[PDB]
Amino acid sequence: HLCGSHLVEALYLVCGERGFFYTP
Amino acid sequence: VNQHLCGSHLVEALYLVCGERGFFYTP
Amino acid sequence: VNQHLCGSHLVEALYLVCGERGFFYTP
Amino acid sequence: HLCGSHLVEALYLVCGERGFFYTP
Amino acid sequence: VNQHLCGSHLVEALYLVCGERGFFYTP
Amino acid sequence: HLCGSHLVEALYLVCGERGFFYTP
Amino acid sequence: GIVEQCCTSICSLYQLENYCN
Amino acid sequence: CCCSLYQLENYCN
Amino acid sequence: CCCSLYQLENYCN
Amino acid sequence: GIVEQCCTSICSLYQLENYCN
Amino acid sequence: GIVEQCCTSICSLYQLENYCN
Amino acid sequence: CCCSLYQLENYCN
Ligand SMILES: NCCc1c[nH]c2ccc(O)cc12
Ligand SMILES: NCCc1c[nH]c2ccc(O)cc12
Ligand SMILES: NCCc1c[nH]c2ccc(O)cc12
Ligand SMILES: NC(=[NH2+])NCCC[C@H](N)C(=O)O
Ligand SMILES: NC(=[NH2+])NCCC[C@H](N)C(=O)O
Ligand SMILES: NC(=[NH2+])NCCC[C@H](N)C(=O)O
Ligand SMILES: [Cl-]
Ligand SMILES: [Cl-]
Ligand SMILES: [Zn+2]
Ligand SMILES: [Zn+2]
């Protein structure tokens, strides 16, 4: 379903305002 | 806002730049 | 225009938000 | 060839001005 | 700048438009 | 690792200022 | 619709969901 | 599709 | 994930 | 080229195709 | 951080790398 | 490639 830069794109749609870590 | 659209491009850039390490984004 | 570039980001957002339902985009 | 958000990106390059439905 | 962000969208557009031929981008 | 429009996205992060050819 | 609304103010996942089928 | 750019034009408004 | 949009919300700040 | 043209006016699939090899 | 810096001036792969873990 | 970011730099102008 969500891999590589698509997972980061998915994270940014939800958290783009709150911010986040991406720690593979 | 052109900052939000911008952030979209930054996170994709960090994905590629940072690799196995990963990153923190916090606007 | 920053509206067209914007629309690019909206449709990708609707893709993910809408899922199996799908969406209509109409600028 | 064109799957997931790449298909939507493909649809937006052609129809981004005319608009469209995306009904999987 | 909204030109750089723009260029991002252009190259993705050329990818799809140009196909097997390919393209040159030069800002 | 990098295929289709992801390869072009990768090329643009490095060369987006210098410019480039994409000749598959 | 979605342009005039969501490309002036940053929309939310509620404002975006109104354009789903 | 998972077609072409020109075939995709069939889906616009 | 390679999950959902709502499950993804677990990772924000 | 493509920047100055296509990042001021919205280009078309004709204006974009001139940068193909 | 990264917004205020990197969405005013075009950043470099050095300026971007400071937000890696 | 379908390589690295640094190897990709070989293709710029
Ligand atoms: N909650 C932020 C939703 C979101 C993600 N990407 C976007 C782009 C434009 C917009 O109005 C909204 C968004
Ligand atoms: N027919 C619209 C072509 C198109 C798609 N994305 C674009 C981005 C910039 C631009 O000038 C043009 C485009
Ligand atoms: N060396 C250009 C790095 C880069 C790629 N995409 C970007 C987007 C925003 C930015 O500030 C910087 C970038
Ligand atoms: N706008 C986006 N990047 N959406 C996510 C697309 C998911 C994609 N099909 C994948 O390979 O994981
Ligand atoms: N700019 C774009 N999103 N282009 C479409 C890329 C197609 C991609 N190789 C796929 O998995 O279907
Ligand atoms: N921001 C980007 N487009 N990054 C490149 C993503 C690579 C992707 N996982 C692929 O299928 O090749
Ligand atoms: Cl943008
Ligand atoms: Cl993919
Ligand atoms: Zn953009
Ligand atoms: Zn992909």
Residue numbers in the entry:
A (entry chain B), D (entry chain B), F (entry chain B): 5 to 28
B (entry chain D), C (entry chain D), E (entry chain D): 2 to 28
G (entry chain C), J (entry chain C), K (entry chain C): 1 to 21
H (entry chain A), I (entry chain A), L (entry chain A): 6 to 7, 11 to 21
Publication passage describing the model:
Insulin is one of the key human protein hormones that is responsible for the maintenance of metabolic homeostasis, with an influence on cell proliferation and regulation of aging. Insulin is a 51-amino acid protein consisting of two disulfide-linked chains (A1-A21, B1-B30) and exerts its functions through binding as a monomer to the (αβ)2 heterodimer tyrosine-kinase-type insulin receptor (IR)5 (10, 11). Insulin is produced from a single chain pro-insulin and stored in pancreatic β-cells in storage granules (termed large dense core vesicles (LDCVs)) from which it is released into the bloodstream in response to elevated blood glucose levels. The in vitro data showed that insulin hexamers can be grouped into three structurally distinct states/families: T6, T3Rf3, and R6 (15, 16), which differ by the conformation of the B1-B6 N termini of the hormone B-chain.
A similar set of crystallization conditions yielded crystals of insulin in a ternary complex with serotonin and arginine (referred to here as InsSerArgT3R3). Despite their similarity, two of these forms (f1, f2) (referred to as InsSerArgf1-T3R3 and InsSerArgf2-T3R3) are reported here due to a dynamic (i.e. with high level of disorder) nature of Arg/insulin binding, hence the need for more independent structural evidence about the nature of these interactions. Despite the presence of arginine, the serotonin modes of binding in sites I are practically the same as in the Ins-Ser complex. Some serotonins in site III are bound in a fashion observed in InsSerT3R3; however, some of these ligands are flipped in both InsSerArgT3R3 crystal forms, i.e. the -OH and aminoethyl groups switch their positions. Arginine is accommodated there in channels within the T3 trimer, parallel to the hexamer 3-fold axis and opposite to R3 trimer sites I filled by serotonin, which leads to filling the voids around Zn2+ and His-B10. The flexibility of arginine is concentrated mostly around its -CαNH2COO− moieties, which form weak alternative HB to main chain groups of CysB7 and HisB5, also exhibiting some flipping around the Cα atom. In contrast, the guanidinium groups of the arginines are firmly engaged in extensive networks of HBs, which link them with side chains of GluB13, the side- and main-chain of HisB10, and the side chain of SerB9. This simultaneous binding of the two very different ligands to the T3R3 insulin hexamer polarizes this oligomer even further into two structurally distinct trimers, Arg3T3 and Ser6R3.
